[model samples]
Target chain A: PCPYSDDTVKMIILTRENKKHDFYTLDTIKKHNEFKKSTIKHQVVFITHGFTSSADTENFLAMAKALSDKGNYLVILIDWRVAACTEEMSGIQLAYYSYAASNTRLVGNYIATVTKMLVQKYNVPMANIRLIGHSLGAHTSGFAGKKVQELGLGKYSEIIGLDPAGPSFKSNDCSERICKTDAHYVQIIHTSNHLGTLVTLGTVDFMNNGYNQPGCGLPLIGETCSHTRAVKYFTECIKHECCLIGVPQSKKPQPVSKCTRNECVCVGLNAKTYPKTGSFYVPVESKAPYCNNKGKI
Target chain B: PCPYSDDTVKMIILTRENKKHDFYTLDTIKKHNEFKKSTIKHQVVFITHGFTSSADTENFLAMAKALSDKGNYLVILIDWRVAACTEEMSGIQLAYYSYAASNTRLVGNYIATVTKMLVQKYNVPMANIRLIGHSLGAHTSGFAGKKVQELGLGKYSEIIGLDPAGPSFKSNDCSERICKTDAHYVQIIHTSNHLGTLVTLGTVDFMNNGYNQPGCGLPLIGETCSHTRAVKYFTECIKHECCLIGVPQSKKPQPVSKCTRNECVCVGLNAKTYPKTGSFYVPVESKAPYCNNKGKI
Candidate 1:
């Protein structure tokens, strides 16, 4: 098994352990971070992969690493049968067929299990946990969150869908049947406009019907925030770590840069290295870099 | 009765043959523009208004005149009971509540009646009809389109929604259901990132949740298009009309000129005229000027 799979599988199993999975049990995961070792102040973040995306996409790993590096967080990257199963899938054609056969329940079950395990084992309160899913991963996130909620595993307050697949999910009913969740906040972003065209049409339906075609009628041109990249936005989204009590008004999130050209970067972390703490930051070259301030753009 | 309401009520009475009941025939209302008289050889365009808005909003009038000025197609504005009834109401809060209690369905029914009447009386084939709704108007458009479709009034080939109220419909389990056939191609634009907050918190929900909270974890900044006054974007969105025929291409919509500065002079007639069209053209300035194409500050 790949190292990530092994680690993830082990984490799942460890969480499932009856007595051994306690706050004091895993010293390494906690000690690895800079925060206090035993503080119950923790968060559970779930990450799911998109179509043809395996457990090894750099973007996914970067997000995982970023969250982990950010401190006081338990990041779980979900690897489903679809991830390993659809190794050869390509383009929209294969994407549809592969997604068709994949068992989302298995993925959902695994997420539910992991979520429950984390809440019990790590003292990661359900409200603190945030789920992030990309593309089909969004479906996985929705399915998992909904199932977990139904299973009485935990309560998820937020779910960030980075461009939820629009075709199968948008045009047809399978998507409707899939990721239906009552998570306090569920936002699905359509990264590339092709989401509507690729998913076999009619499976996806827009929350607002008059939204621009393809991706809810958003601008296809211009600098959009990253599609598969989550580390930056995820870090910014966490309420506790980022939106803590009384950091003063200046410390609040704000876009530091504007889009001078096509290279506009929105609000995000400023990291000196790849495995850097995922605190939000701004860059000068960003075309439309956002932070916290509104009407600043 | 006021002239407008008197004429409207008269038409309703005449169409319904003076029925005392609340149900009224919608076709009796005056058309926003006279398509046949205005020189249309082919199809006609229908426009609908949202909650508390009238068929006579400056933007609406501009749009009708602009398209009619193009001279090939007719533009029809749906001045449903919602707009007409609310005209006499006071305050946003009161109008909104009244609308929530009743207007949605009433407007929808009016659309169905009008569409049927237009088809029967004018021999306007369903294929040639394009329906556009703004905010709650979009919902009405969908509701009418679906009813017409069921009644075999013909298919509403295209429907465009301008930032249809997300919170109002999506969150209200019973209040927010639209039939798929409401239009052949229904495109919803969520201009305001405030959709989630709007739904979850209602109008008062934002008191605690922060104004313009990125509803449902949509990007707090860059990712979402802001909820500005939608008139311009609504105009930009209709540019899609050109693509309705033939193969779709990634052509840029025609751009509207932006006033160099905020708070521009408001002249009579020229006061709110759209930059490009109409006989009256005037410049306006504001304290906060809108961003231009070059990304200029």
Candidate 2:
């Protein structure tokens, strides 16, 4: 139903060692099997950006750097900018986002096709691959996972959704949006209920500061900050290890994250290691170093 | 989303050798790996019947016997009879058909799973299996085909959608209904425009006798005759090869069927052989030996 064609979505690869040196689209290396050779022995990661956002943006760049900093990973930035948006939200741009919402299926299909190309033709270990999406990208990630699962290859390792978008995706029908069946382990963060969903979509859904975050202003005007906070929390987790964690209770989060120390679940990167699947309470600071529980927000 | 469990959809295999002897469900041979052994060296054909219809019924039995009569084919009747119907129409039963329409996803998923099991575990070739569904069963076949392709193992041989259901299945989103992408080749026949979709859905769509068939009565009351005509036309094709053929032009049906004798395409069994893709027009008689082109239909 998307107005655009399949070529609208693009896959840009980034690596830990050379973040900018050998950057290219999946099509660049697809036919020649250069993808397999370029990725080498490193683990693969797919990062999908949301509406009005591109792979080259600060959000995806920051996440990429944080992920690349930790290990030898082939981070794939899924840039659906052509179909997602051209820019600034307001007026007709909002309608573009609606079309972007429909475009997720096409975007997801391309990602799934790339995954099949990697797993089947290139011999990539599907068991180790991970998918991360923010806002609309979250359902985009879900769509990709759903498609890959549809391919009968079973499921990939993890899908970390950073506040999956709520509109056009509230379908309880698992076929519509992000759900647990999409992967082996799904870890979700809810930073903005108005922009993102409060529903538990993954194995472990962390309701960070519940509906509204501290100092996040009024409704639509300030929901952007709260929505993007998911990226910050996840990237911080990737960069700082078990720093961002949540307690098991959905109502409170005043405990530690060290599993042995306080029986808590870590957020983002290291979240899937724990065998838990449900909603959890996660308190955070009003400012950067948001993992600080002492902050009164 | 279906009210019943996954066990509700059953797969019953019927070959020419023993019509009643080796009748078994997928669960019966599933874990033991007896399915692969039973259906050896022969091509597989999946026939899914519509709402209020069962595999043992005349519709599917005739289809099974017809396909069995032609070649070395293991006719697997996808009897979602429990999920599709328990029977009849009117009042609350109409509501059941609505539920049955939604139940196609569950049935489709099960069929896809069985397909994956056979292709991956039992070593069945994914290239040769053909799926056929009538009315709501037609859309069910599309769902199965969609799931199989989603599994990453390319497409099956063909999917013959006999007057695909139009009620809950009018999704323009190919993700929702039976589409051309579901198989290597898709051939559809429309007998009733009201019950069946008038929209083109396959590689080759045959509009038989322009919607309302002769003596087929009116709308819901008489549409059953028109609707069931798809099965009659297809079964007749299987029994007597190339007997029911259509002309290439969408506007006219006054022509010969033999591709060599005249530019035309065969209806059922040998429908996929021709490279044609688009809507075709075919005139038919009011009754049996319905392929008679000499009649004033």
Candidate 3:
């Protein structure tokens, strides 16, 4: 058993009424009025980020705001920065990549605890829970899903990996990393293959621009520029329904034959229907307004 | 235990002598002449990508080429797109986020297994290992680091997280996600807070543009443009040393006092020294030539 520390994790709740919740502890959550006011009927979306990042990230905030703006859903922002840092000590600055990796399991376990609380204490249905993570956070959601299953809780409704990380785990066994078993349904968007995995790790995997994004200059931060496209594209999906059409790419990048038998999938936040399994490809614009009706069926 | 499958993962070894290796199995790696010719003395840098991406992602390939161009280093591109997608069942298309999240752990575990093989079979020292991942891949490196420790394989030299994810794991416990204990050193660069996390997840965390990048306009792909800045900044660091100086920011953006005690940490690919702990902020240009000598020590 690994050393379990409570100080390492934090959960912040956001809603349309209250944009930012002050405290992040369970005790605070128990006493907090905002959480109390939050209804269980509303769907819950957990937005996550990658390494060296926090809930305070802009897009996360934007996403929370956007989601809240859309409806009465509860948007929770996870802030695990203190424990995610390289050095456990506050004053020391260094990279402890391994430490963070091992800690993710613990974090997932804690999220399960919190999720159980939400289900039992607050009546938030496990089916209403949606975990959306980018990079490491993507796997963190997976851990949460696993925890949900381990605790005998019902499976989460959906788990989204926005360009799931593809380094230490790309070629590893499924038991060691995120896999299809973690959730009832898993959706992944591949934007920047340079820093992401190229395989099909989710129930529905959407390849954007053949996993090599445009507008990401070769000499510049092309690697990350492309990697982050997943979030932006997903964000757009949240608002636009007909954006980012995913065409079937079985062998290679080729033209789609037709939408028969749901051969094509739409990549976005509010994706309605999807094929149970398959690799789909989508073309994007070089700049903003990346999605269009080019391939929409 | 989760279902362990090996066909989902793929690893591609790249070197100056051989730009791309055809096969990606352990058996192939054992018998490959290029693997035999590779020396442990040469530093091994695994350049990974983020969600819905691949090793062939242009930026990843570019980084590999650039790193190889620097000479005396073996660069490997991890391609796990096979397992990262929605489904391999054929004729099915959809998005499965949670499924991919769970698979990342498996991928990380696989990377660790292969890395251990490299250390034992090919004389590659764990101390000589450097894992660099952006977004989800960042934590993938963290998982790799942890696997190395779990297997009692010794510690990796360094791990780099370029704008690690923040959504689901951000507020969760570090035990569930990336933490400092993953490697000897964990350095992170934050560019887009929306898609990326703002909290310092690395031993040394550098905040570029106060975690809300400049020049990223609303309604455009601004969120991703800023989020990917970390990779761009880090890539610059690989070649240039004086780039991306980190100035201390208590609350608001302020100027640095001096270079004494190495008050400023460089935020880039080859970040040499970083402040032990504390959120260090920096200003960057909206366009290329993003860094300046504003807070250089």
Error of 2 at A154 (Å): 59
DockQ scores of the candidates: 0.01, 0.00, 0.02
- Highest DockQ scorer: 3
lDDT of 2 at B288: 75
Candidate structures ordered by lDDT, highest first:
2, 3, 1
Q: Encode model 3's per-residue lDDT on B1-297: one tens digit a residue.
A: 123366656667776666753647655666655576555566788876766556765456666766776767778776665555522323222244345556666778878988887788788888777888877777777888888899998788888888877765566566556677788888777777666777768677777754657644332235666766677667766656656677665576556445443666666544545543566776775544466664445
Give the C-alpha miss distance for residue B104 in model 1, angstroms.
1.9
Please report, as a residue range, the 10-residue window in candidate 3 chain A with the lowest summed lDDT.
A86-95
Model 3 ranges off by over 4 Å = A1-4, A21-23, A37-39, A86-95, A219-221, A251-261, A294-297, B1-297
Please give the ranking of all candidate structures by DockQ, highest first, separated by commas: 3, 1, 2
Error of 1 at B61 (Å): 1.3
lDDT of 3 at A31: 64
Give candidate 1 regions above 4 Å deviation.
A1-297, B1-41, B81-85, B88-95, B98-101, B172-175, B178-180, B195-228, B237-297
Model 2, range B43-89, lDDT digits (tens) per residue?
Answer: 68888888878777786788888877654677888877767765434
Clash pairs, candidate 2, are A150-B150, A150-B151, A151-B150, A151-B151, A151-B152, A152-B151
lDDT of 1 at B39: 29
CA lDDT of A118 in candidate 2?
77
Angstrom error at residue B137, model 2: 0.9
Model 2 CA deviation exceeding 4 Å by range:
A1-297, B21-23, B30-39, B87-90, B218-220, B252-254, B257-262, B293-297
